[PDB]
Amino acid sequence: QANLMRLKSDLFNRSPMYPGPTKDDPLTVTLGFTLQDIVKVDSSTNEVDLVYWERQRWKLNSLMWDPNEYGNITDFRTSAADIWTPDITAYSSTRPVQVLSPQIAVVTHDGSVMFIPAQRLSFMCDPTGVDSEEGVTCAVKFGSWVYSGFEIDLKTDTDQVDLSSYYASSKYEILSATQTRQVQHYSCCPEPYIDVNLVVKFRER
Amino acid sequence: QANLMRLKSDLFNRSPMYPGPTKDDPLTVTLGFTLQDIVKVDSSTNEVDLVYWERQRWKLNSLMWDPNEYGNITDFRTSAADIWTPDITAYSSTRPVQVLSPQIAVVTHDGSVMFIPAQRLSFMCDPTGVDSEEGVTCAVKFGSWVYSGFEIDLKTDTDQVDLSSYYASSKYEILSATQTRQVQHYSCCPEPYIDVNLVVKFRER
Amino acid sequence: QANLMRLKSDLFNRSPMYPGPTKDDPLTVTLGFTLQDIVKVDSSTNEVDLVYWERQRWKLNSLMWDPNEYGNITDFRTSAADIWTPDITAYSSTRPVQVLSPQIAVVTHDGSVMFIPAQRLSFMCDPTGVDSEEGVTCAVKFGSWVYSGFEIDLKTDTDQVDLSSYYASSKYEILSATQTRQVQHYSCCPEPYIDVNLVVKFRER
Amino acid sequence: QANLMRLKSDLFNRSPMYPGPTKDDPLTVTLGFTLQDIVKVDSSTNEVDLVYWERQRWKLNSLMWDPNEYGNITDFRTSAADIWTPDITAYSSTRPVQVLSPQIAVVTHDGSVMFIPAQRLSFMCDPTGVDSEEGVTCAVKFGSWVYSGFEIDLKTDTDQVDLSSYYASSKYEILSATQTRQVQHYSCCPEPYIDVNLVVKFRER
Amino acid sequence: QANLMRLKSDLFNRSPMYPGPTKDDPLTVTLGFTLQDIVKVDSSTNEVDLVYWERQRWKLNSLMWDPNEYGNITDFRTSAADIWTPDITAYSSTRPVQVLSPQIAVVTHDGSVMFIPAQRLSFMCDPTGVDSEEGVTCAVKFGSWVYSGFEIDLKTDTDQVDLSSYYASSKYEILSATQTRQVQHYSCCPEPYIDVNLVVKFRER
Ligand SMILES: CN1[C@@H]2CCC[C@H]1C[C@@H](NC(=O)c1nn(C)c3ccccc13)C2
Ligand SMILES: CN1[C@@H]2CCC[C@H]1C[C@@H](NC(=O)c1nn(C)c3ccccc13)C2
Ligand SMILES: CN1[C@@H]2CCC[C@H]1C[C@@H](NC(=O)c1nn(C)c3ccccc13)C2
Ligand SMILES: CN1[C@@H]2CCC[C@H]1C[C@@H](NC(=O)c1nn(C)c3ccccc13)C2
Ligand SMILES: CN1[C@@H]2CCC[C@H]1C[C@H](NC(=O)c1nn(C)c3ccccc13)C2
Ligand SMILES: *C1O[C@H](CO)[C@@H](O)[C@H](O)[C@H]1NC(C)=O
Ligand SMILES: *[C@@H]1O[C@H](CO)[C@@H](O)[C@H](O)[C@H]1NC(C)=O
Ligand SMILES: *[C@@H]1O[C@H](CO)[C@@H](O)[C@H](O)[C@H]1NC(C)=O
Ligand SMILES: *[C@@H]1O[C@H](CO)[C@@H](O)[C@H](O)[C@H]1NC(C)=O
Ligand code: NA
């Protein structure tokens, strides 16, 4: 708490805050999902609720420091409201996402930030076939809402969704879960937008 | 990050916020709807729920700059709470509108602002006949709540609601989707009032 | 915009906020209701849901200005948070009232304020007989919570509830809707309180 | 209004907020309840919902003033957020309480404060026998959450619950309703613990 | 109350905010659960709702003080927002935890802090067999969300969950309730994490 108080002051109070990436200084955000449980399936309205962890990672020069000047501190924890965060969001949610975890990020001396919110999400899915052997497939896109591919690019560290914390006695079993970076060119806008596509095939019991 | 900080502070920290339009200095807000899905139909209460993107566009002289002065930044993204926004509301909602996307807008050097919140709206519609071949038509009007057409004029770039992102496997099919500007030279108050009427015709299957 | 910025700064940033009325300087608030729809009837809990606009009007000398001193501005819109508002509330709600419109008010140069929040309200009503030819009668009264008649008085411009914007395809037809000034005395307190009684008789179909 | 603003400035700005009661300077909170309706009874979850008013009264020397020094002002109204309030909490709630009235308090020149929030409360109650003629009895205790009897004392003005505003067409019929101060000493601690027990016997029709 | 104001001002305002523990200056959080009721069991979504109090205890050296310098004050109550708090969270919640008690803590002159918030938690649990004589078992982990064992270790003053406040007329009786410290090693990280595993076996009637 000696040099850690002095470090956080030198980063947040003295210096201004990141106003977000630009075309001249773009940013790459790494995205990884941890599927925990499929909680609800509404066939009357086509809604499916997921509980998942959202791994987000990015790096800013204006967060870097030299450990030898701050008690050999390599990393720290702080409120996610102390730093800038990307506007990563689902394209087809039907309700406001609810947050299940503390909003705290980890900041490392290279300027890399690690932020992993646990969330609950209702989204659009016709769940017809979930009670069959073949199951049913759903998909929901995640990406920046207002920044283009020239300002925020996405990447994944793997095409496989982490299922190592999927709830055992879940009403549903996961057949396949894949997260896949796409580059989307919409008819509305001259700039492309980049998303990671969370695709899940699943079935009952 | 260097020129953008200076730009954001010159625009926001060096002038009081735009107090809004007046009779002498009216404003034109362009409006457009993207129907993503019809999410709920209640024939017992006559409530229908929509998920849509509401595109709002306007231009302010006080938000103009010369890029040459700012490292040739032509546009930037900022929190919607940094800038003035129009009081566009649905005239027949039954529940508070729920925001599904980040509250971020796009400001351009010409002074223009693009703001597209994704939203869930519950409004008044008798869905009787939805299970017929002919379907049922709902309608909901959007406009400024407190500004007359003398301060805020409305406008659409097209009469057709954007259906390019409509849920491929939706519970309902859209038969027609129109967005129409309407002007009341009388609405219980001696003053011209303007709305954009959203008319949606749809049926089950 | 230059003059309006100045008027608002002069009103809101150079004088302490109005501390509300007192016995020595009372206030009269005008109240009117516009019934848009009866959205829910629950005979198992005796709750009825209304959607209405509540019109509130009052005058403060501390909001007066001479137009000549400010570009001939005669009136402007501002956030309701910028001004004092009366604590008018429904007496028999069963759930927190929900606001459906922007919290913005019109201020006029003579010091008059017009504030019209659209709302959804759940209140105590036994709807027994609503499917009868005669119908059922519900009532909810609205008043200040902590200001007596010596500090806040209420009046109405008409005794008839505005039904000109009632949903044409509502589940319920309105047989009569009145709004009446009433003096209430409580056992706890000597001072009388003033409210406005909203009486609505309606039926199905 | 000049004297009021001056008085408010003197109480809330020329001084720090009351840090709360201590063992050297204890405080007595008078508690009284007003039952308005019993709105929900869930026999499967053992939850009952009340709509009631919680009357709290205490007196601070720091809130005293001589009316002669302030143009004869003997009392005023002000947002509950401007002053300290006791942590009177229900001990067996199942859900967060929902506020139904404005949060304004009345402050009298003797330093006394009167604060009466209207609330919807969900609490633990096996309602078995509510349809019988003997009905059912439910109870919920109210007191400080973190202050012992050494810091906050509780007191009632009467043992009868105010039924003068009980909903006339309520689904239920109140057989008895009492509010009783209770003290429980413990062998580990010299500090007593104080609560007011709200006991309601009721039945259908 | 004069001494208390000066104490709180010396500890909070004339001192930098505690930045949380590190590898160098780690922290031990003592954890305890008082179970009040099992309020909901959903067998179609595998969700169980608990209401409980969560006793948190820890000690900062930065919150120590000499009572002799501040009028023999041994402890005081203050908002949980005035001080740093551990990010203890449930690992398998399905909805945001709902706080039922005031967010106030107690700080002792030795620097120790006791924080006991009442809560409603929804978590993943297959309730299959609850209506049987053997009953059913649920488990939920609680621990820091961003800190490892190096920064935060957990402790329990006992291994039995307090059932002395369990609702007597509950829909369910408890068969066993344990709170047991566990040390994990998730594959993502080379550092260990501490958690306390609340395990509850129970049944109807
Ligand atoms: C990820 N985001 C980007 C692409 C679409 C969804 C969001 C919002 C944002 N959308 C848009 O900018 C957008 N959408 N429509 C239908 C338009 C029509 C005309 C002009 C702009 C737009 C950009
Ligand atoms: C966009 N807005 C304008 C047009 C109607 C919808 C909203 C509400 C606003 N309403 C009104 O201003 C309004 N309404 N009633 C019944 C009144 C009676 C007397 C004076 C004013 C009003 C006007
Ligand atoms: C409209 N108002 C609401 C809140 C305060 C003033 C009035 C009267 C009423 N509340 C009262 O103030 C009130 N009620 N009871 C039973 C009391 C007992 C002692 C002192 C005051 C009261 C409700
Ligand atoms: C207001 N309070 C009451 C209700 C819950 C919150 C607080 C905590 C309080 N509990 C106590 O602090 C408590 N209880 N027992 C049996 C003890 C034995 C030794 C030391 C402390 C306690 C109970
Ligand atoms: C369960 N966890 C959460 C809460 C604390 C213990 C652990 C550790 C912590 N972080 C992680 O869970 C975590 N980190 N990375 C890089 C991951 C990659 C894939 C899956 C999970 C993670 C948060
Ligand atoms: C508390 O403070 C007083 C004042 O200085 C001190 O003299 C005394 O030791 C303490 N209390 C007792 C035991 O008198
Ligand atoms: C755009 O502005 C930049 C400022 O660095 C300038 O270097 C550049 O010349 C400008 N564009 C043109 C016309 O080259
Ligand atoms: C307002 O209007 C009057 C009359 O038209 C005009 O003479 C005066 O200059 C105006 N004041 C301002 C500042 O616009
Ligand atoms: C209160 O002020 C008025 C004068 O404005 C006067 O009637 C009265 O004397 C004053 N109070 C007392 C106690 O005199
Ligand atoms: Na009243």
Side-chain angles (χ1 to χ4, degrees), chain E residues 59-116:
Chain E
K59 173 171 169 169
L60 301 186
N61 311 269
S62 61
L63 289 178
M64 300 177 61
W65 75 84
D66 192 347
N68 315 333
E69 292 182 9
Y70 295 93
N72 290 6
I73 290 180
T74 63
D75 43 75
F76 69 93
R77 280 73 180 169
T78 199
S79 170
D82 291 320
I83 64 180
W84 173 92
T85 61
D87 63 337
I88 315 289
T89 172
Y91 286 0
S92 57
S93 68
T94 57
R95 299 178 198 279
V97 61
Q98 313 189 250
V99 184
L100 306 173
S101 67
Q103 298 282 49
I104 306 179
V106 180
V107 197
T108 305
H109 72 91
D110 70 339
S112 55
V113 178
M114 194 81 56
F115 184 32
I116 324 179

Coordinates of all heavy atoms in Angstrom, one line a residue, chain E residues 59-116:
Chain E
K59 N -9.1 -7.0 9.0 CA -8.4 -6.0 9.7 C -7.3 -5.2 8.9 O -6.5 -5.8 8.3 CB -7.7 -6.6 10.9 CG -6.8 -5.7 11.7 CD -6.3 -6.4 13.0 CE -5.2 -5.6 13.7 NZ -5.0 -6.1 15.1
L60 N -7.5 -3.9 8.9 CA -6.5 -3.0 8.2 C -5.7 -2.4 9.3 O -6.2 -2.0 10.4 CB -7.1 -2.0 7.4 CG -8.1 -2.4 6.3 CD1 -8.5 -1.1 5.5 CD2 -7.4 -3.4 5.4
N61 N -4.4 -2.2 9.1 CA -3.6 -1.4 10.0 C -3.9 0.1 9.8 O -3.7 0.9 10.8 CB -2.1 -1.7 9.8 CG -1.8 -3.2 9.7 OD1 -1.5 -3.9 10.7 ND2 -1.9 -3.8 8.5
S62 N -4.4 0.4 8.7 CA -4.7 1.8 8.3 C -5.9 2.3 9.0 O -6.3 3.5 8.9 CB -4.8 1.9 6.8 OG -5.8 1.1 6.3
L63 N -6.6 1.4 9.7 CA -7.9 1.8 10.4 C -7.7 1.7 11.9 O -8.7 1.7 12.7 CB -9.0 0.9 10.0 CG -9.6 1.2 8.6 CD1 -10.7 0.3 8.2 CD2 -10.0 2.7 8.4
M64 N -6.4 1.7 12.4 CA -6.1 1.6 13.8 C -6.1 3.0 14.4 O -5.8 4.0 13.7 CB -4.8 0.9 14.1 CG -4.8 -0.5 13.6 SD -3.2 -1.3 13.8 CE -3.0 -1.3 15.6
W65 N -6.5 3.2 15.6 CA -6.4 4.5 16.3 C -6.3 4.3 17.8 O -6.8 3.4 18.4 CB -7.6 5.4 15.9 CG -8.9 5.0 16.5 CD1 -9.4 5.4 17.7 CD2 -10.0 4.2 15.9 NE1 -10.6 4.9 18.0 CE2 -11.0 4.2 16.9 CE3 -10.1 3.6 14.7 CZ2 -12.2 3.5 16.6 CZ3 -11.3 2.9 14.5 CH2 -12.3 2.8 15.4
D66 N -5.7 5.3 18.5 CA -5.6 5.4 19.9 C -6.9 6.0 20.5 O -7.2 7.2 20.2 CB -4.4 6.2 20.4 CG -4.1 6.1 21.8 OD1 -5.0 5.6 22.6 OD2 -3.0 6.5 22.3
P67 N -7.7 5.2 21.2 CA -9.0 5.7 21.8 C -8.7 6.9 22.7 O -9.6 7.8 22.8 CB -9.5 4.5 22.6 CG -8.9 3.4 21.9 CD -7.5 3.8 21.5
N68 N -7.6 6.9 23.3 CA -7.2 8.0 24.3 C -7.1 9.4 23.6 O -7.1 10.4 24.3 CB -5.9 7.6 25.0 CG -5.9 6.2 25.5 OD1 -7.0 5.6 25.8 ND2 -4.7 5.6 25.6
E69 N -6.8 9.3 22.3 CA -6.7 10.6 21.5 C -8.0 11.1 21.0 O -8.1 12.2 20.6 CB -5.7 10.4 20.4 CG -4.3 10.2 20.9 CD -3.3 10.1 19.7 OE1 -3.7 10.3 18.5 OE2 -2.1 9.7 19.9
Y70 N -9.0 10.2 21.0 CA -10.3 10.6 20.4 C -11.5 10.3 21.3 O -12.5 9.9 20.9 CB -10.5 9.8 19.1 CG -9.6 10.2 18.0 CD1 -8.4 9.5 17.8 CD2 -9.9 11.3 17.1 CE1 -7.5 9.8 16.8 CE2 -9.0 11.6 16.1 CZ -7.8 10.9 15.9 OH -7.0 11.3 14.9
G71 N -11.2 10.6 22.6 CA -12.3 10.5 23.6 C -12.8 9.1 23.9 O -14.0 8.9 24.0
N72 N -11.9 8.1 23.9 CA -12.2 6.8 24.4 C -13.2 6.1 23.5 O -13.9 5.2 23.9 CB -12.8 6.9 25.8 CG -11.7 7.3 26.9 OD1 -10.6 7.5 26.5 ND2 -12.1 7.2 28.1
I73 N -13.2 6.5 22.2 CA -14.0 5.8 21.2 C -13.3 4.5 20.8 O -12.2 4.5 20.3 CB -14.1 6.6 19.9 CG1 -15.1 7.8 20.2 CG2 -14.7 5.8 18.8 CD1 -15.3 8.7 19.0
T74 N -14.0 3.4 21.1 CA -13.4 2.0 20.8 C -13.9 1.5 19.5 O -13.1 0.8 18.8 CB -13.8 1.0 21.9 OG1 -15.2 0.8 21.9 CG2 -13.3 1.5 23.3
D75 N -15.0 2.0 19.0 CA -15.5 1.6 17.7 C -16.6 2.6 17.2 O -17.1 3.4 18.0 CB -16.1 0.2 17.7 CG -17.0 -0.1 19.0 OD1 -18.1 0.4 19.0 OD2 -16.5 -0.8 19.9
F76 N -16.9 2.6 15.9 CA -17.9 3.4 15.3 C -18.5 2.8 14.1 O -17.9 1.9 13.4 CB -17.3 4.8 14.9 CG -16.3 4.8 13.8 CD1 -16.8 5.0 12.5 CD2 -15.0 4.6 14.0 CE1 -15.9 5.0 11.4 CE2 -14.1 4.6 13.0 CZ -14.5 4.8 11.7
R77 N -19.7 3.2 13.8 CA -20.5 2.7 12.6 C -20.3 3.7 11.5 O -20.4 4.9 11.6 CB -22.0 2.6 12.9 CG -22.4 1.3 13.6 CD -21.9 1.3 15.1 NE -22.3 0.1 15.8 CZ -21.9 -0.2 17.0 NH1 -21.1 0.6 17.7 NH2 -22.3 -1.3 17.6
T78 N -20.0 3.2 10.3 CA -19.8 4.0 9.1 C -20.3 3.3 7.8 O -20.2 2.1 7.8 CB -18.4 4.6 8.9 OG1 -18.4 5.7 8.1 CG2 -17.5 3.5 8.4
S79 N -20.6 4.1 6.8 CA -21.1 3.5 5.5 C -20.0 2.6 5.0 O -18.8 2.8 5.1 CB -21.4 4.6 4.5 OG -21.6 4.1 3.2
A80 N -20.5 1.5 4.3 CA -19.6 0.6 3.6 C -18.9 1.3 2.5 O -17.8 0.8 2.0 CB -20.3 -0.6 3.2
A81 N -19.4 2.4 2.0 CA -18.8 3.1 0.9 C -17.6 4.0 1.4 O -16.8 4.4 0.6 CB -19.9 4.0 0.2
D82 N -17.6 4.3 2.7 CA -16.5 5.0 3.2 C -15.1 4.3 3.2 O -14.1 4.8 3.3 CB -16.8 5.5 4.7 CG -17.9 6.5 4.7 OD1 -17.9 7.4 3.9 OD2 -18.7 6.4 5.6
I83 N -15.2 2.9 3.1 CA -14.1 2.1 3.3 C -14.0 1.0 2.2 O -14.9 0.7 1.5 CB -14.1 1.3 4.6 CG1 -15.3 0.4 4.7 CG2 -14.2 2.3 5.8 CD1 -15.4 -0.4 6.0
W84 N -12.8 0.4 2.1 CA -12.5 -0.7 1.2 C -13.2 -1.9 1.7 O -13.3 -2.1 2.9 CB -11.0 -0.9 1.1 CG -10.7 -2.2 0.3 CD1 -10.4 -2.2 -1.1 CD2 -10.6 -3.5 0.7 NE1 -10.1 -3.5 -1.4 CE2 -10.2 -4.3 -0.4 CE3 -10.8 -4.1 2.0 CZ2 -10.1 -5.7 -0.2 CZ3 -10.6 -5.5 2.1 CH2 -10.3 -6.3 1.0
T85 N -13.7 -2.7 0.7 CA -14.4 -4.0 1.1 C -14.0 -5.1 0.2 O -13.7 -4.8 -1.0 CB -15.9 -3.8 1.1 OG1 -16.4 -3.5 -0.3 CG2 -16.4 -2.8 2.0
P86 N -13.9 -6.3 0.7 CA -13.5 -7.5 -0.2 C -14.5 -7.8 -1.2 O -15.7 -7.6 -1.0 CB -13.3 -8.6 0.9 CG -14.3 -8.2 2.0 CD -14.2 -6.7 2.0
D87 N -14.1 -8.3 -2.3 CA -15.0 -8.6 -3.4 C -15.5 -10.0 -3.4 O -15.6 -10.7 -4.4 CB -14.4 -8.3 -4.8 CG -13.2 -9.2 -5.1 OD1 -12.6 -9.7 -4.1 OD2 -12.8 -9.4 -6.2
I88 N -15.9 -10.5 -2.2 CA -16.4 -11.8 -2.0 C -17.7 -12.0 -2.7 O -18.7 -11.3 -2.5 CB -16.7 -12.1 -0.5 CG1 -15.5 -11.7 0.4 CG2 -17.0 -13.6 -0.3 CD1 -14.3 -12.5 0.2
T89 N -17.8 -13.0 -3.7 CA -18.9 -13.2 -4.5 C -19.2 -14.7 -4.6 O -18.3 -15.5 -4.5 CB -18.7 -12.6 -5.9 OG1 -19.8 -13.0 -6.7 CG2 -17.4 -13.0 -6.5
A90 N -20.5 -15.0 -4.9 CA -20.9 -16.4 -5.2 C -20.4 -16.8 -6.6 O -20.4 -15.9 -7.5 CB -22.4 -16.6 -5.1
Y91 N -19.9 -18.0 -6.8 CA -19.3 -18.4 -8.0 C -20.4 -18.9 -9.0 O -20.1 -19.0 -10.2 CB -18.2 -19.5 -7.9 CG -16.9 -18.9 -7.3 CD1 -16.8 -17.6 -7.0 CD2 -15.8 -19.8 -7.1 CE1 -15.6 -17.1 -6.5 CE2 -14.6 -19.3 -6.6 CZ -14.5 -18.0 -6.3 OH -13.3 -17.5 -5.8
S92 N -21.5 -19.2 -8.5 CA -22.6 -19.8 -9.4 C -24.0 -19.1 -9.1 O -25.0 -19.9 -9.0 CB -22.7 -21.3 -9.3 OG -22.9 -21.7 -8.0
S93 N -24.0 -17.8 -9.1 CA -25.3 -17.1 -9.0 C -25.9 -17.1 -10.4 O -25.2 -17.2 -11.4 CB -25.1 -15.7 -8.5 OG -24.4 -14.9 -9.4
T94 N -27.3 -17.0 -10.5 CA -28.0 -16.9 -11.7 C -28.7 -15.6 -11.9 O -29.2 -15.3 -13.0 CB -29.0 -18.0 -11.8 OG1 -29.9 -17.8 -10.7 CG2 -28.4 -19.4 -11.8
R95 N -28.7 -14.8 -10.9 CA -29.2 -13.4 -10.9 C -28.4 -12.6 -10.0 O -27.8 -13.1 -9.1 CB -30.7 -13.4 -10.5 CG -31.6 -14.3 -11.3 CD -33.1 -14.3 -10.8 NE -33.8 -15.5 -11.4 CZ -34.4 -15.5 -12.6 NH1 -34.2 -14.4 -13.4 NH2 -35.0 -16.5 -13.1
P96 N -28.4 -11.2 -10.2 CA -27.7 -10.3 -9.3 C -28.1 -10.5 -7.8 O -29.3 -10.5 -7.6 CB -28.0 -8.9 -9.8 CG -28.4 -9.2 -11.2 CD -29.0 -10.5 -11.3
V97 N -27.2 -10.6 -6.9 CA -27.6 -10.7 -5.5 C -28.3 -9.4 -5.0 O -27.9 -8.3 -5.4 CB -26.4 -11.0 -4.6 CG1 -25.3 -9.9 -4.7 CG2 -26.8 -11.2 -3.1
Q98 N -29.4 -9.6 -4.3 CA -30.2 -8.5 -3.8 C -29.9 -8.2 -2.3 O -30.2 -9.1 -1.4 CB -31.7 -8.8 -4.0 CG -32.0 -9.3 -5.4 CD -33.5 -9.4 -5.6 OE1 -34.1 -10.5 -5.7 NE2 -34.1 -8.2 -5.7
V99 N -29.4 -7.0 -2.0 CA -29.1 -6.7 -0.6 C -30.3 -6.3 0.2 O -31.1 -5.4 -0.2 CB -28.1 -5.5 -0.6 CG1 -27.7 -5.2 0.8 CG2 -26.8 -5.9 -1.4
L100 N -30.5 -6.9 1.4 CA -31.7 -6.7 2.2 C -31.4 -5.8 3.4 O -32.4 -5.4 4.1 CB -32.2 -8.1 2.6 CG -32.4 -9.1 1.5 CD1 -32.8 -10.4 2.2 CD2 -33.6 -8.6 0.6
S101 N -30.2 -5.5 3.7 CA -29.8 -4.8 4.9 C -29.1 -3.5 4.6 O -28.5 -3.4 3.5 CB -29.0 -5.6 5.9 OG -27.8 -5.9 5.3
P102 N -29.0 -2.5 5.5 CA -28.2 -1.3 5.3 C -26.7 -1.6 5.0 O -26.2 -2.5 5.6 CB -28.3 -0.6 6.6 CG -29.6 -1.0 7.1 CD -29.8 -2.4 6.7
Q103 N -26.1 -0.8 4.1 CA -24.7 -1.0 3.7 C -23.8 -0.3 4.7 O -23.1 0.6 4.3 CB -24.5 -0.5 2.3 CG -25.3 -1.3 1.2 CD -24.7 -2.6 0.9 OE1 -24.4 -3.4 1.8 NE2 -24.5 -2.9 -0.4
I104 N -23.8 -0.7 6.0 CA -23.1 -0.1 7.0 C -22.2 -1.1 7.7 O -22.6 -2.2 7.9 CB -24.0 0.6 8.1 CG1 -25.0 1.5 7.4 CG2 -23.2 1.3 9.1 CD1 -26.0 2.2 8.3
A105 N -21.0 -0.6 8.1 CA -20.0 -1.5 8.7 C -19.6 -0.9 10.1 O -19.9 0.2 10.4 CB -18.8 -1.7 7.9
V106 N -18.9 -1.8 10.9 CA -18.4 -1.3 12.2 C -16.9 -1.5 12.2 O -16.4 -2.5 12.0 CB -19.1 -2.1 13.3 CG1 -18.5 -1.7 14.7 CG2 -20.6 -2.0 13.3
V107 N -16.2 -0.4 12.6 CA -14.8 -0.4 12.7 C -14.3 -0.2 14.1 O -14.8 0.7 14.8 CB -14.2 0.7 11.8 CG1 -12.7 0.4 11.5 CG2 -14.9 0.8 10.5
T108 N -13.4 -1.1 14.5 CA -12.9 -1.0 15.9 C -11.5 -0.4 15.9 O -10.9 -0.3 14.9 CB -12.9 -2.5 16.5 OG1 -14.2 -3.1 16.4 CG2 -12.4 -2.4 18.0
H109 N -11.1 0.2 17.1 CA -9.9 0.9 17.2 C -8.6 0.1 16.9 O -7.6 0.6 16.6 CB -9.8 1.5 18.6 CG -9.5 0.5 19.7 ND1 -8.2 0.1 20.1 CD2 -10.3 -0.3 20.4 CE1 -8.3 -0.8 21.0 NE2 -9.6 -1.1 21.2
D110 N -8.8 -1.2 16.9 CA -7.6 -2.1 16.5 C -7.5 -2.2 15.0 O -6.6 -2.9 14.5 CB -7.8 -3.5 17.2 CG -8.9 -4.3 16.6 OD1 -9.8 -3.8 16.0 OD2 -8.9 -5.6 16.8
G111 N -8.4 -1.6 14.3 CA -8.4 -1.6 12.9 C -9.3 -2.6 12.2 O -9.3 -2.7 11.0
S112 N -9.9 -3.4 13.0 CA -10.8 -4.5 12.5 C -12.1 -4.0 12.0 O -12.7 -3.1 12.6 CB -10.9 -5.6 13.5 OG -11.4 -5.1 14.7
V113 N -12.7 -4.7 11.0 CA -14.0 -4.3 10.4 C -14.9 -5.5 10.4 O -14.5 -6.6 9.9 CB -13.8 -3.8 8.9 CG1 -15.1 -3.4 8.3 CG2 -12.8 -2.6 8.9
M114 N -16.1 -5.3 10.9 CA -17.2 -6.3 10.8 C -18.3 -5.8 9.9 O -18.9 -4.8 10.1 CB -17.7 -6.6 12.2 CG -18.5 -7.9 12.2 SD -17.5 -9.4 12.3 CE -16.5 -9.0 13.8
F115 N -18.6 -6.6 8.8 CA -19.6 -6.2 7.9 C -20.6 -7.4 7.7 O -20.2 -8.5 7.2 CB -18.9 -5.9 6.5 CG -19.9 -5.4 5.5 CD1 -21.0 -4.6 5.8 CD2 -19.7 -5.6 4.1 CE1 -21.9 -4.2 4.9 CE2 -20.5 -5.2 3.2 CZ -21.7 -4.4 3.5
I116 N -21.8 -7.2 8.0 CA -22.8 -8.3 8.0 C -24.1 -8.0 7.2 O -25.1 -7.7 7.7 CB -23.3 -8.7 9.4 CG1 -22.1 -8.6 10.4 CG2 -23.9 -10.1 9.4 CD1 -22.5 -8.9 11.8

